[PDB]
Design a protein around this nucleic acid. Sequence first.
DNA 1: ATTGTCATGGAATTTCGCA
DNA 2: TGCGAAATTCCATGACA
DNA 3: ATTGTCATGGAATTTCGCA
DNA 4: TGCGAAATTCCATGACA
Lengths: 368, 368, 184, 184
Amino acid sequence: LDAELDQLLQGHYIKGYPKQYTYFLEDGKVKVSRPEGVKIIPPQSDRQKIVLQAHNLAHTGREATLLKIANLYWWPNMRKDVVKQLGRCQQCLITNASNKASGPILRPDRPQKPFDKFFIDYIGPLPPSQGYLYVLVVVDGMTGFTWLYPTKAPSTSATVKSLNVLTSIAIPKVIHSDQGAAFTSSTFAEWAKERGIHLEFSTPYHPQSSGKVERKNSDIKRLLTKLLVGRPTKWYDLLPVVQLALNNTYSPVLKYTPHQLLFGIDSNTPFANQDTLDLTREEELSLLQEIRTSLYHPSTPPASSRSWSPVVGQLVQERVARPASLRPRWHKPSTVLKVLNPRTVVILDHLGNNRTVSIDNLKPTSHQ
Amino acid sequence: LDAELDQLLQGHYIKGYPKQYTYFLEDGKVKVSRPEGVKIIPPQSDRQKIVLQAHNLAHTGREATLLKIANLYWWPNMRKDVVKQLGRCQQCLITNASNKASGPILRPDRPQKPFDKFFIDYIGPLPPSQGYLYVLVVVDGMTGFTWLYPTKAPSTSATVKSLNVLTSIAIPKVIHSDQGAAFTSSTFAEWAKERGIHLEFSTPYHPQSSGKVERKNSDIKRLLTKLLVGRPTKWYDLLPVVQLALNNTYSPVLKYTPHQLLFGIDSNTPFANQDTLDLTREEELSLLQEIRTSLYHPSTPPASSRSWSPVVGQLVQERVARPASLRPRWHKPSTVLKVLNPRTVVILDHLGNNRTVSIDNLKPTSHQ
Amino acid sequence: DRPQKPFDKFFIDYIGPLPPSQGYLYVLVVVDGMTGFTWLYPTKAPSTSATVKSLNVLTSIAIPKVIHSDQGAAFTSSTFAEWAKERGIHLEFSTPYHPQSSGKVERKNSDIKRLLTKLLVGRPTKWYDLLPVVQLALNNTYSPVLKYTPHQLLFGIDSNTPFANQDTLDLTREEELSLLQEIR
Amino acid sequence: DRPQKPFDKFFIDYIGPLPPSQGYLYVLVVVDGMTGFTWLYPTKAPSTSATVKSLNVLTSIAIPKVIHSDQGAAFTSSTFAEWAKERGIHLEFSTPYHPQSSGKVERKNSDIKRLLTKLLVGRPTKWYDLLPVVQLALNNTYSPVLKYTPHQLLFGIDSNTPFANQDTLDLTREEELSLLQEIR
DNA sequence: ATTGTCATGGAATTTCGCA
DNA sequence: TGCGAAATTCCATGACA
DNA sequence: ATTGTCATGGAATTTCGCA
DNA sequence: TGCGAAATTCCATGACA
Ligand SMILES: O=C1c2ccc(O)c(O)c2C(=O)N1Cc1cccc(Cl)c1F
Ligand SMILES: O=C1c2ccc(O)c(O)c2C(=O)N1Cc1cccc(Cl)c1F
Ligand SMILES: [Mg+2]
Ligand SMILES: [Mg+2]
Ligand SMILES: [Mg+2]
Ligand SMILES: [Mg+2]
Ligand SMILES: [Zn+2]
Ligand SMILES: [Zn+2]
C-alpha cells in the first residue's frame, strides 16, 4: 500500500512498476505519466474497492470493467485484479451466459437385438379425438418398430394398461424413458420390477437422450398432419394406419424398414419385398441375423472449435430448469464428482444431493 | 403403354430398355430378369398410379418411395416419375421441412448520425411493478444510446406518451420497429407523419430485423436480473439506474460507451474519461466526428455449404406463423415478384396480396 | 413350390362363453401357421363387429395373406368379407363339421384350451388380466417337431422370458376336485 | 484553466404558478451552461420533492458536475442537499436578491419566459402538450455569440428539425389586446 | 415496401520492458 | 534484435416473445 | 445413476450400357 | 478402357413439449 508507493516516490525500483516512467506526487496522490496520459496509482489496499465499484456500475466483464478503471487509474497487472473480482461476483456467475459449447455428441451403439431396449415417450396434448388427448409411443431400439397407444392423460396408469398389451408379444430387457411424471412414479417402478424389466432414465431436461423415440414422434406428427390436411383433426382413428405405415417405411440409409428388421420378411402389405421367397425360414433368419449386425452406425462428429469437456473436481453450473421472469438462468457453482462419460456427469448439487446431469445443462464456472 | 411393350416382347429395341436383358411374358404380365431379380414392367399408362400408391403409404420422399416400387417393378427412369409425383403432392409440399439453409445475413451499415434511425420495441409482460408490466425500449442506431419507459401495456397510446417525452430532445429521421400492434396502428402512423418521422417496419415474424434493439433488450434484462438477485422483482425503480448504467458501458470492440458516441464527452458519472480535458468543445466535436466515422463494422459471414438465394419468379413457400396442432408448417407455393436484397423478397402470396417477407421465413419449393 | 413363411396363414377361432372377466366373455384366438405364434383378444361376443375391432389391432402390426376359419357366423358374414377384401386378405373356410387346420396348429389350439382351463380354476373371473402371461407362455414353449419356440421363429432371437419349465398343463387332484364341484 | 464543457454546470429554476394544464402548475427549467441546451419539466409545486422527481429523469440521461440556483426553498432544503451529495453533484447558490448566471444563460432564460408567454395566450391551458415543441425551438435556435445552436454543441451534428425562421417572439397587437384583457 | 447484434472470457497475436 | 510476460485483439457462443 | 436421431432432396460419386 | 447418363450414396438441414 503506502510503504510500497513511498518506497517508489523516492525513485527506487519496485517489481511491477517499470523504471522508465516518472512517478510523482500531486493533490495528495501518487501519479504517473503513461503514454495514454497521467493516471493515479492507488495504494494496494484501495484496489479491490476500485475494481469493485467499476464492475458494479453495470456488472461488466473483463474488458468493459478494465476500460472504466483505466480512465482514472493505473497499476501493475490490472486485469488480474479485475478477473479476481469477476470470479467472486455471485450475481455475474449465475446470470451470465456461457461462451463455451458442449463437447461433441455420443452416438450410443444400436441395441443388439429386438427387445433389448425400448424407448418410450408421450406426445400431446393433441386436439381431443374421441376423448383422447395423448399418444404413448414405444420404439424398439434395434429395429425402430413402433407401437402407438391413444391415452386420456400421460399417466403411470395409462402407461401400464398399454404396456400390458404390448408386452403380451415380448418382454424387453430395458425400457428407457425421460423423467416425465408417468415414468418416475413408484407404481411404474414396481410394474417393471414385477417383470424383470430394467428402467433407464434420461438425464433431466435433455430430450436428445430419448432421441430414438423423439425422432419417431416427428415422423408420427408429420404423417398425421398430411393425412389430416383439409379435414378436421380426427386423429384417433389414424393411429393404427400411421403405426403400420411407418413400421413398413424404408430408411434410405439402412435400406430396410423396421418391420423387416423385426421379422426378416414383409407381411401382406403393399409392395412387399419378395427376395427371400425361395429361402427356408431358417435360411431367411440367418440372413436377418447377418443384416442386423452390419447396419450403418454413425460416429461422434468433430468437436466445435470452442467446446469444453468436464474434468473431475471442476466447478460447473447447472442450468435452472424453468427460470422465473428476471431470475438467473444458472444455479450456484457445484463440483464434478464423477465423469460418467464425456457428455454425462455426476455433480454435488445446489442443495447437497448427487445429480446425474447432461453436459448440455452445464457451464464451466468462469475465472475458475 | 401396350404398343411399346408389345413392340418390346418380340425382341426389338426400345429406347430406355437396355438390350442385354431378356424381356418375357408370364401370368399375363411383362417381366424382366434384372440382377436384383425378376420385376414386372408395367405399361406406361399404369406408372403414375403405381408411383402414387407407393408414395401414399406414408408420404415418403424420393428414395423411400423408390424402394417400395423397386420391390415389384422396374422401368426406365423410375426416379423421374417418383420426383414428378413429389412435386405435385400438396400434402408433402406444405408439411415437409426444408433442407436448404438461408443465405448469409446482411450487416446493414451503421446509421451515420445520432437521430438518423431509432429502433423501438417492447419487453414484457414482466412481473407487476407499481402497476407496470412492460418497458418501451428506444435505441439510437448510431450510438446505441437507449431510453427506457415503463408502460402498463404495449399500446400505441403509451408509445406516443413516451415518444412525446423523448422527442423533446430531438426528432429522428426514421423510426424502425417490428410489426407489433402498437406500431402498425393508424394512430401511430399519424403521430409520425405529424412530425416528418418516417416509419420503417421489419418483415413479419423476424425479430433479427430489430437486432439493434433486441440485443439491447438482452443487456437490459441481464442487468435487471443481477440487481434483483435475492430481492423481490421490484424493477420499476431500477429502469433509470439501468438506463444510465448501460448508456455509460463500454463496448469492448468499439472502445466507446454509447454516451460518448452521443456527446463526445462523459458527464459526471463514475470513472469519467478525461482525455479531452484540454480541447475546446469544438476541437472535441471534430474528434467525435472522426471517431464516429471510423467505428468497426462487421461483414457478411460465409454462406453455409447448402444455402439458397431467391431468384425472381421462383416457387417458394412462406412459413405459417402460428400453426395449429397437427397442421402444416408451410403455406402453398407462391412466386418471387421482386428480390429486394439477397435476404428480402416480395412474393405474390397465399391469398393474392403482395408481401414483403424475410428469406428466413421461406423455403424454396422442392422438385421445382 | 415355395417354403412356408410367417404371415402366410393366420388361423382364427373363438373360445367361449367364459365366466365374465372385466366385462369380457370370449377369446379370439389367432395362430400363425408357419410359426405357431399365438395372439389372443378378449371380446364381448363372437360377432363380426368384435372380430373386426380385434383384428384391426393385430393387422396394424402385420397382415396375413390368408385367414383360415370354421364357418362361424362372425367369419362368414358379408361385412367380414368386405373387411378382408379391403385389406387384400384371402378368406378360407374348413367345410362345416369337418374342422381341419394343421397338426402344429391343432396341437397349439389344444395347448391353449388346456392352459386356459388350468388358470380359470380358482380364479374363473380373473382371466382377463392373465391373457398377457398366457401368450408369453404359449410363445416361449418349445416345439418337439421344430427345434424352436414361436418367439424364435417369428423374431429370429432368443427371448428375455424363456419358459424353462415345460410345465404340468394337467390338473392336480385339488383342481379336478373343485372344478368337478364348481361346474355343478 | 481548462475550456468549458457540456455538463460542467446546469442552471436550474422554477417558472410559475401558471394556469393549470393537465394538472400541472410550474416548469422546472434546466439549461446547460456551456451549450445553452434547455430541458423543461412540468411540476405540481416548487418543492424539493418535485425537483428531485424531475431531476431524476434528467440525471438518468446525464449528470452535471455542478447545479447552480437561486436560494429557492426547494433548492436550499437539506433533502435536496442529501440528493446531490449522493450523486456527487456540487451545489451552488447565487446570493439572495442578487441572481447571477452568465449572459448566455440569462438570454436563454429570457427567451424561455417570452416564448412561454407567447403560447400561453389564446391557450393558457394547453401548455403541457407544447413543452416538447418549445424545447426543440429553444434548442434549434441560432446563437449570435457562438456560430451554433445548442443542439449542435451538444451532439456535434445538424438537427432534423432546424428552426429556419428565427421568429417574432413578440406579441402581435391582437395578443397584447386579449392578454391585457384576460389578465384583469 | 427491406436488411441481425454485441457482451463475454479463453486463446491467439501484438506490444512492452529491458537488454 | 531478441526474449518472457503483459496487454490487446480475436472471435465463437448464445440470447434478445 | 448415463449417452441424440434420421427423413429429406440436391450434389457428389459410382456404376451401368455400350462400344 | 472410355464415354454420357442413370443410379446410388453422401450429407447438411431441421424438428422431435
Ligand atoms: O422439449 C421437449 C420435451 C420436454 C419434456 C418431455 O417430457 C418431452 O418428451 C419433450 C420433448 O419431446 N421435447 C421436444 C424436444 C425439443 C428439443 C429437442 C428434442 Cl430431441 C426434443 F425432443
Ligand atoms: O421472438 C421474439 C419476438 C416476437 C415478437 C415481437 O414483437 C418481439 O419483440 C419478439 C422478440 O423480441 N423475440 C425474441 C427473439 C427471438 C429470437 C431471435 C431474436 Cl433476435 C429475438 F429477439
Ligand atoms: Mg416426454
Ligand atoms: Mg418427447
Ligand atoms: Mg416486439
Ligand atoms: Mg423484441
Ligand atoms: Zn457482477
Ligand atoms: Zn405426399
